[PDB]
Amino acid sequence: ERPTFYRQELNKTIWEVPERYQNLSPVGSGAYGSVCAAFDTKTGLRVAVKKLSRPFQSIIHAKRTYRELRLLKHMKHENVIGLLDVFTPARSLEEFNDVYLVTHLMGADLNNIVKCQKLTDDHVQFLIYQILRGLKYIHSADIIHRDLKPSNLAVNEDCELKILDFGLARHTDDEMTGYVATRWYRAPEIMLNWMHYNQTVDIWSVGCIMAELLTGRTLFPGTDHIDQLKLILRLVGTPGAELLKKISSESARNYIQSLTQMPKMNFANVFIGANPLAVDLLEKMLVLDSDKRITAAQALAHAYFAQYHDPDDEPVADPYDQSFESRDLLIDEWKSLTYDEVISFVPPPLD
Ligand SMILES: CCNC(=O)NCc1ccccc1Sc1ccc2nnc(C(C)C)n2c1
User: Fold this and answer.
1) Residues 86 and 192 in one domain
2) In a mutational test of the pocket of ligand 1, which residue from 11, 35, 46, 101 has the highest number of ligand atoms less than 8 Å from its CB?
Protein backbone atom coordinates (compact mmCIF):
# COMPACT_ATOMS: atom_id res chain seq x y z
CA GLU A 1 0.00 0.00 0.00
CA ARG A 2 0.87 3.73 -0.42
CA PRO A 3 2.07 5.46 2.82
CA THR A 4 0.67 8.86 3.87
CA PHE A 5 2.86 11.72 2.67
CA TYR A 6 3.14 15.17 4.35
CA ARG A 7 4.54 18.42 2.88
CA GLN A 8 6.94 21.07 4.17
CA GLU A 9 9.18 23.79 2.78
CA LEU A 10 12.96 23.23 3.11
CA ASN A 11 15.81 25.17 1.30
CA LYS A 12 13.03 27.04 -0.72
CA THR A 13 11.96 23.55 -2.03
CA ILE A 14 8.76 21.62 -1.20
CA TRP A 15 9.51 18.29 0.53
CA GLU A 16 6.63 15.78 0.29
CA VAL A 17 7.80 12.64 2.14
CA PRO A 18 6.08 9.71 3.97
CA GLU A 19 4.98 10.20 7.64
CA ARG A 20 7.69 7.72 8.91
CA TYR A 21 10.41 10.40 8.26
CA GLN A 22 10.28 13.08 10.93
CA ASN A 23 12.41 16.12 11.95
CA LEU A 24 13.82 16.83 8.48
CA SER A 25 16.77 19.28 8.59
CA PRO A 26 19.12 20.27 5.71
CA VAL A 27 22.68 18.86 6.00
CA GLY A 28 26.05 19.23 4.25
CA SER A 29 25.60 22.92 3.23
CA GLY A 30 24.68 21.93 -0.38
CA ALA A 31 27.88 19.78 -0.69
CA TYR A 32 25.85 16.56 -1.30
CA GLY A 33 23.00 18.40 -3.08
CA SER A 34 19.45 18.78 -1.63
CA VAL A 35 19.94 16.44 1.39
CA CYS A 36 18.10 16.42 4.75
CA ALA A 37 18.88 14.44 7.93
CA ALA A 38 15.70 12.79 9.21
CA PHE A 39 14.61 10.35 11.87
CA ASP A 40 13.09 7.17 10.43
CA THR A 41 10.45 6.07 13.01
CA LYS A 42 10.06 2.69 11.26
CA THR A 43 13.73 1.56 11.57
CA GLY A 44 14.89 3.85 14.37
CA LEU A 45 17.76 5.03 12.16
CA ARG A 46 19.02 8.51 11.42
CA VAL A 47 18.79 8.76 7.64
CA ALA A 48 19.96 11.07 4.81
CA VAL A 49 17.12 11.92 2.39
CA LYS A 50 17.97 13.44 -1.03
CA LYS A 51 15.39 15.18 -3.17
CA LEU A 52 16.82 14.97 -6.73
CA SER A 53 17.08 18.37 -8.47
CA ARG A 54 15.68 18.65 -12.04
CA PRO A 55 15.85 14.78 -12.46
CA PHE A 56 14.48 14.69 -16.08
CA GLN A 57 15.54 18.14 -17.49
CA SER A 58 17.65 16.52 -20.27
CA ILE A 59 18.63 13.05 -21.65
CA ILE A 60 21.96 13.27 -19.66
CA HIS A 61 20.17 14.27 -16.43
CA ALA A 62 17.40 11.60 -16.99
CA LYS A 63 20.21 9.00 -17.51
CA ARG A 64 22.01 10.42 -14.38
CA THR A 65 18.87 9.89 -12.24
CA TYR A 66 18.52 6.31 -13.56
CA ARG A 67 22.29 5.58 -13.07
CA GLU A 68 22.23 6.79 -9.44
CA LEU A 69 19.05 4.81 -8.50
CA ARG A 70 20.43 1.68 -10.25
CA LEU A 71 23.88 1.98 -8.52
CA LEU A 72 22.31 2.63 -5.02
CA LYS A 73 19.83 -0.32 -5.41
CA HIS A 74 22.67 -2.70 -6.34
CA MET A 75 24.97 -1.91 -3.36
CA LYS A 76 24.40 -4.10 -0.30
CA HIS A 77 27.74 -3.83 1.62
CA GLU A 78 28.65 -2.40 5.10
CA ASN A 79 31.29 -0.03 3.63
CA VAL A 80 29.31 1.14 0.63
CA ILE A 81 26.33 3.52 0.78
CA GLY A 82 23.11 1.73 -0.21
CA LEU A 83 19.40 2.37 -0.62
CA LEU A 84 17.26 2.08 2.52
CA ASP A 85 14.28 3.53 0.62
CA VAL A 86 13.13 5.30 -2.57
CA PHE A 87 9.82 7.20 -3.00
CA THR A 88 7.68 9.58 -5.05
CA PRO A 89 4.43 11.35 -3.96
CA ALA A 90 3.16 10.52 -7.55
CA ARG A 91 0.41 7.85 -7.98
CA SER A 92 1.19 7.20 -11.71
CA LEU A 93 3.96 7.75 -14.35
CA GLU A 94 1.75 10.56 -15.84
CA GLU A 95 2.15 12.47 -12.54
CA PHE A 96 5.82 11.29 -11.90
CA ASN A 97 8.21 14.15 -11.32
CA ASP A 98 10.24 13.75 -8.15
CA VAL A 99 12.61 11.07 -6.80
CA TYR A 100 13.64 10.87 -3.13
CA LEU A 101 16.61 8.66 -2.19
CA VAL A 102 17.07 7.40 1.40
CA THR A 103 20.27 6.05 2.98
CA HIS A 104 22.07 5.81 6.34
CA LEU A 105 23.30 9.08 7.84
CA MET A 106 26.90 8.75 9.03
CA GLY A 107 26.98 12.38 10.14
CA ALA A 108 30.48 13.35 9.06
CA ASP A 109 32.99 12.88 6.14
CA LEU A 110 36.70 11.82 6.46
CA ASN A 111 37.86 15.51 6.68
CA ASN A 112 35.28 16.32 9.46
CA ILE A 113 37.25 13.75 11.57
CA VAL A 114 40.97 14.11 10.59
CA LYS A 115 41.66 17.80 9.85
CA CYS A 116 45.46 18.67 9.61
CA GLN A 117 46.13 15.77 12.08
CA LYS A 118 48.39 12.72 11.88
CA LEU A 119 46.38 9.87 13.59
CA THR A 120 47.49 6.60 15.34
CA ASP A 121 48.46 3.65 13.12
CA ASP A 122 45.44 1.63 14.47
CA HIS A 123 42.90 4.26 13.31
CA VAL A 124 44.56 4.49 9.82
CA GLN A 125 44.47 0.67 9.70
CA PHE A 126 40.72 0.45 10.42
CA LEU A 127 39.88 3.43 8.18
CA ILE A 128 41.88 2.15 5.12
CA TYR A 129 40.68 -1.46 5.73
CA GLN A 130 37.02 -0.37 5.43
CA ILE A 131 37.79 1.72 2.28
CA LEU A 132 39.54 -1.32 0.75
CA ARG A 133 36.76 -3.77 1.84
CA GLY A 134 34.07 -1.59 0.21
CA LEU A 135 36.25 -0.93 -2.87
CA LYS A 136 36.78 -4.75 -3.37
CA TYR A 137 32.94 -5.07 -3.49
CA ILE A 138 32.45 -2.00 -5.83
CA HIS A 139 35.21 -3.30 -8.20
CA SER A 140 33.66 -6.87 -8.16
CA ALA A 141 30.51 -5.34 -9.74
CA ASP A 142 32.82 -3.82 -12.49
CA ILE A 143 32.06 -0.25 -11.12
CA ILE A 144 34.83 2.37 -10.82
CA HIS A 145 34.58 5.20 -8.30
CA ARG A 146 36.74 7.73 -10.31
CA ASP A 147 36.21 10.41 -7.57
CA LEU A 148 37.55 8.66 -4.42
CA LYS A 149 38.51 11.36 -1.90
CA PRO A 150 37.95 12.08 1.88
CA SER A 151 34.81 14.21 1.23
CA ASN A 152 33.31 11.04 -0.44
CA LEU A 153 33.89 8.90 2.68
CA ALA A 154 31.02 8.96 5.22
CA VAL A 155 32.23 8.29 8.75
CA ASN A 156 30.25 7.91 12.02
CA GLU A 157 31.24 8.54 15.75
CA ASP A 158 32.57 4.92 16.04
CA CYS A 159 34.89 5.40 12.95
CA GLU A 160 32.66 3.16 10.80
CA LEU A 161 32.90 4.17 7.09
CA LYS A 162 30.62 4.12 3.96
CA ILE A 163 31.84 5.06 0.43
CA LEU A 164 29.70 7.73 -1.37
CA ASP A 165 29.53 8.85 -5.04
CA PHE A 166 30.92 5.73 -6.82
CA GLY A 167 30.19 5.15 -10.55
CA LEU A 168 28.68 8.59 -11.37
CA ALA A 169 29.37 11.29 -14.07
CA ARG A 170 28.54 14.06 -11.53
CA HIS A 171 32.31 14.59 -10.64
CA THR A 172 32.91 15.73 -14.28
CA ASP A 173 30.92 18.95 -13.36
CA ASP A 174 33.48 19.77 -10.56
CA GLU A 175 36.06 22.52 -10.95
CA MET A 176 39.41 20.74 -11.47
CA THR A 177 41.47 23.99 -11.91
CA GLY A 178 44.15 25.28 -9.52
CA TYR A 179 44.83 24.60 -5.85
CA VAL A 180 41.67 22.41 -5.39
CA ALA A 181 41.11 19.21 -3.36
CA THR A 182 38.81 17.84 -6.16
CA ARG A 183 42.02 17.00 -8.15
CA TRP A 184 44.58 16.03 -5.40
CA TYR A 185 43.47 12.37 -5.21
CA ARG A 186 43.22 11.70 -8.97
CA ALA A 187 45.56 9.14 -10.62
CA PRO A 188 47.81 10.86 -13.22
CA GLU A 189 46.36 8.71 -16.07
CA ILE A 190 42.76 9.99 -15.30
CA MET A 191 43.88 13.61 -14.48
CA LEU A 192 45.89 14.01 -17.76
CA ASN A 193 43.83 11.51 -19.91
CA TRP A 194 46.87 9.27 -20.67
CA MET A 195 44.85 6.25 -21.81
CA HIS A 196 41.53 4.48 -21.40
CA TYR A 197 41.93 3.82 -17.65
CA ASN A 198 40.60 1.00 -15.38
CA GLN A 199 39.61 0.37 -11.70
CA THR A 200 43.26 0.84 -10.51
CA VAL A 201 42.66 4.66 -10.66
CA ASP A 202 40.87 4.10 -7.29
CA ILE A 203 43.90 2.34 -5.71
CA TRP A 204 45.99 5.49 -6.49
CA SER A 205 43.30 7.53 -4.59
CA VAL A 206 43.46 5.10 -1.56
CA GLY A 207 47.26 5.64 -1.52
CA CYS A 208 46.75 9.47 -1.48
CA ILE A 209 44.26 9.14 1.37
CA MET A 210 46.39 6.62 3.38
CA ALA A 211 49.55 8.85 3.12
CA GLU A 212 47.51 11.92 4.28
CA LEU A 213 46.08 9.97 7.27
CA LEU A 214 49.66 8.85 8.12
CA THR A 215 51.35 12.32 7.84
CA GLY A 216 48.46 14.77 8.41
CA ARG A 217 49.35 16.42 5.03
CA THR A 218 47.93 16.22 1.48
CA LEU A 219 50.23 13.95 -0.57
CA PHE A 220 50.06 15.93 -3.90
CA PRO A 221 48.60 19.44 -3.22
CA GLY A 222 49.37 20.70 -6.74
CA THR A 223 48.63 24.38 -7.54
CA ASP A 224 47.46 23.20 -11.01
CA HIS A 225 47.49 20.03 -13.22
CA ILE A 226 51.19 20.56 -14.21
CA ASP A 227 52.47 21.35 -10.72
CA GLN A 228 50.60 18.23 -9.39
CA LEU A 229 52.19 15.97 -12.09
CA LYS A 230 55.64 17.29 -11.03
CA LEU A 231 54.82 16.50 -7.35
CA ILE A 232 53.74 12.95 -8.48
CA LEU A 233 56.88 12.19 -10.63
CA ARG A 234 59.29 13.57 -7.95
CA LEU A 235 57.97 10.79 -5.63
CA VAL A 236 57.30 7.86 -8.01
CA GLY A 237 59.73 8.82 -10.79
CA THR A 238 59.19 9.60 -14.46
CA PRO A 239 57.69 6.88 -16.75
CA GLY A 240 59.97 4.22 -18.21
CA ALA A 241 59.96 2.65 -21.73
CA GLU A 242 57.14 0.19 -20.95
CA LEU A 243 54.56 2.64 -19.45
CA LEU A 244 55.31 5.16 -22.31
CA LYS A 245 54.19 2.44 -24.80
CA LYS A 246 50.86 2.22 -22.84
CA ILE A 247 50.15 6.01 -22.88
CA SER A 248 47.83 5.91 -25.95
CA SER A 249 47.60 9.75 -26.10
CA GLU A 250 50.42 10.86 -28.43
CA SER A 251 50.15 14.47 -27.07
CA ALA A 252 50.44 13.36 -23.36
CA ARG A 253 53.31 10.91 -24.21
CA ASN A 254 55.11 13.71 -26.11
CA TYR A 255 54.83 16.09 -23.14
CA ILE A 256 55.92 13.42 -20.55
CA GLN A 257 59.16 12.79 -22.53
CA SER A 258 60.06 16.52 -22.45
CA LEU A 259 60.57 16.27 -18.63
CA THR A 260 63.99 15.60 -17.09
CA GLN A 261 63.92 11.95 -15.93
CA MET A 262 63.78 11.24 -12.20
CA PRO A 263 64.16 8.02 -10.19
CA LYS A 264 61.41 6.87 -7.76
CA MET A 265 62.14 8.20 -4.20
CA ASN A 266 62.83 5.96 -1.16
CA PHE A 267 59.37 5.69 0.55
CA ALA A 268 61.03 4.95 3.97
CA ASN A 269 62.72 8.36 3.79
CA VAL A 270 59.51 10.14 2.78
CA PHE A 271 57.32 8.41 5.40
CA ILE A 272 59.68 8.84 8.44
CA GLY A 273 58.67 6.77 11.49
CA ALA A 274 55.54 5.27 9.88
CA ASN A 275 54.83 1.54 10.27
CA PRO A 276 57.15 -0.30 7.78
CA LEU A 277 54.05 -2.35 6.71
CA ALA A 278 52.17 0.93 5.97
CA VAL A 279 55.21 2.14 3.88
CA ASP A 280 55.23 -1.28 2.01
CA LEU A 281 51.45 -0.97 1.27
CA LEU A 282 51.98 2.68 0.08
CA GLU A 283 54.75 1.54 -2.36
CA LYS A 284 52.38 -1.05 -3.88
CA MET A 285 49.53 1.55 -4.18
CA LEU A 286 51.49 4.56 -5.54
CA VAL A 287 52.87 2.85 -8.65
CA LEU A 288 52.78 5.16 -11.70
CA ASP A 289 51.88 2.26 -14.09
CA SER A 290 48.23 1.38 -13.20
CA ASP A 291 48.71 -2.25 -14.41
CA LYS A 292 51.38 -2.76 -11.65
CA ARG A 293 49.32 -1.44 -8.68
CA ILE A 294 47.99 -3.75 -5.93
CA THR A 295 44.24 -4.59 -6.23
CA ALA A 296 41.73 -3.93 -3.37
CA ALA A 297 41.46 -7.76 -2.87
CA GLN A 298 45.30 -8.19 -2.62
CA ALA A 299 45.68 -5.13 -0.31
CA LEU A 300 43.05 -6.61 2.09
CA ALA A 301 45.36 -9.69 2.46
CA HIS A 302 48.41 -7.44 3.25
CA ALA A 303 50.09 -7.86 6.70
CA TYR A 304 49.27 -4.20 7.60
CA PHE A 305 45.59 -5.33 7.97
CA ALA A 306 46.17 -8.69 9.84
CA GLN A 307 44.08 -7.49 12.87
CA TYR A 308 40.99 -6.77 10.61
CA HIS A 309 41.46 -9.12 7.63
CA ASP A 310 39.00 -12.03 7.26
CA PRO A 311 38.57 -13.61 3.75
CA ASP A 312 35.06 -14.92 4.75
CA ASP A 313 33.77 -11.45 5.76
CA GLU A 314 35.01 -9.51 2.64
CA PRO A 315 32.12 -10.19 0.19
CA VAL A 316 31.86 -9.66 -3.58
CA ALA A 317 28.90 -8.15 -5.43
CA ASP A 318 26.07 -9.86 -7.33
CA PRO A 319 26.27 -9.29 -11.15
CA TYR A 320 25.68 -5.59 -12.08
CA ASP A 321 23.97 -5.13 -15.49
CA GLN A 322 25.47 -1.97 -17.01
CA SER A 323 24.12 -2.64 -20.59
CA PHE A 324 21.84 0.48 -20.21
CA GLU A 325 25.05 2.62 -20.40
CA SER A 326 25.37 2.04 -24.19
CA ARG A 327 21.55 2.57 -24.69
CA ASP A 328 20.20 5.50 -26.70
CA LEU A 329 16.88 6.53 -25.12
CA LEU A 330 14.52 9.56 -24.99
CA ILE A 331 13.85 11.52 -21.73
CA ASP A 332 10.39 9.78 -21.35
CA GLU A 333 12.12 6.36 -21.80
CA TRP A 334 14.78 7.03 -19.05
CA LYS A 335 11.98 8.47 -16.85
CA SER A 336 9.76 5.34 -17.30
CA LEU A 337 12.79 3.07 -16.51
CA THR A 338 13.33 5.09 -13.23
CA TYR A 339 9.61 4.89 -12.30
CA ASP A 340 9.80 1.06 -12.73
CA GLU A 341 12.93 1.06 -10.50
CA VAL A 342 11.14 3.27 -7.80
CA ILE A 343 7.92 1.16 -7.85
CA SER A 344 9.78 -2.22 -7.71
CA PHE A 345 12.07 -1.31 -4.76
CA VAL A 346 12.13 -3.96 -2.00
CA PRO A 347 13.28 -2.60 1.40
CA PRO A 348 16.12 -4.26 3.36
CA PRO A 349 14.93 -6.37 6.37
CA LEU A 350 14.50 -4.85 9.85
CA ASP A 351 15.91 -7.11 12.65
C1 LIG B 1 25.67 6.04 -6.76
C2 LIG B 1 26.39 6.54 -5.46
N3 LIG B 1 25.55 7.61 -4.91
C4 LIG B 1 25.67 8.14 -3.66
O5 LIG B 1 26.51 7.74 -2.90
N6 LIG B 1 24.83 9.14 -3.28
C7 LIG B 1 24.83 9.82 -1.98
C8 LIG B 1 23.46 10.08 -1.31
C9 LIG B 1 22.29 9.34 -1.65
C10 LIG B 1 21.08 9.60 -0.98
C11 LIG B 1 21.03 10.58 0.03
C12 LIG B 1 22.17 11.31 0.39
C13 LIG B 1 23.41 11.07 -0.27
S14 LIG B 1 24.91 11.97 0.22
C15 LIG B 1 25.17 11.29 1.81
C16 LIG B 1 24.73 9.95 2.17
C17 LIG B 1 24.99 9.47 3.47
C18 LIG B 1 25.68 10.32 4.44
N19 LIG B 1 26.06 10.19 5.74
N20 LIG B 1 26.65 11.28 6.11
C21 LIG B 1 26.68 12.16 5.12
C22 LIG B 1 27.28 13.56 5.10
C23 LIG B 1 26.40 14.58 5.79
C24 LIG B 1 28.62 13.62 5.80
N25 LIG B 1 26.08 11.60 4.04
C26 LIG B 1 25.85 12.07 2.75
Assistant:
1) no
2) 35
- Which residue segment(s) compose the domain that 61 sits in? 15-107
Q: Which of 87, 107, 127 is the last residue in one of the domains?
A: 107
| Elucidated via | X-ray
Q: What is the 3-state secondary structure (H, E, C) of the chain?
A: CCCCEEEEEECCEEEEEECCEEEEEECHHHCCCCEEEEEECCCCCEEEEEECCCCCCCHHHHHHHHHHHHHHHHCCCCCECCCCEEECCCCCHHHCCCCEEEEECCCEECCCCCCCCCCCHHHHHHHHHHHHHHHHHHHHCCCCCCCCCHHHEEECCCCCEEECCCCCCHHHHCCCCCCCHHHHCCCHHHHCCCCCCCCCHHHHHHHHHHHHHHHCCCCCCCCCHHHHHHHHHHHHCCCCHHHHHHCCCHHHHHHHCCCCCCCCCCHHHHCCCCCHHHHHHHHHHCCCCHHHCCCHHHHHCCHHHCCCCCCCCCCCCCCCCCHHHHCCCCHHHHHHHHHHHHHHCCCCCCC
- Provide the resolution (angstroms): 2.3
Give the Å distance between the CA of 4 and the centre of ligand 1: 25
Q: Which of 40, 85, 98, 165 is catalytic?
A: 165
**Residues within the annotated binding site for ATP?**
27-35, 50
**Same domain flag for 100 and 243:** no
Pocket flag, ligand 1, residue 45 (CB < 6 Å): no
Check whether residue 26 and residue 100 sit in a common domain: yes
Give distance in angstroms: CA of 91 to centre of ligand 1: 26
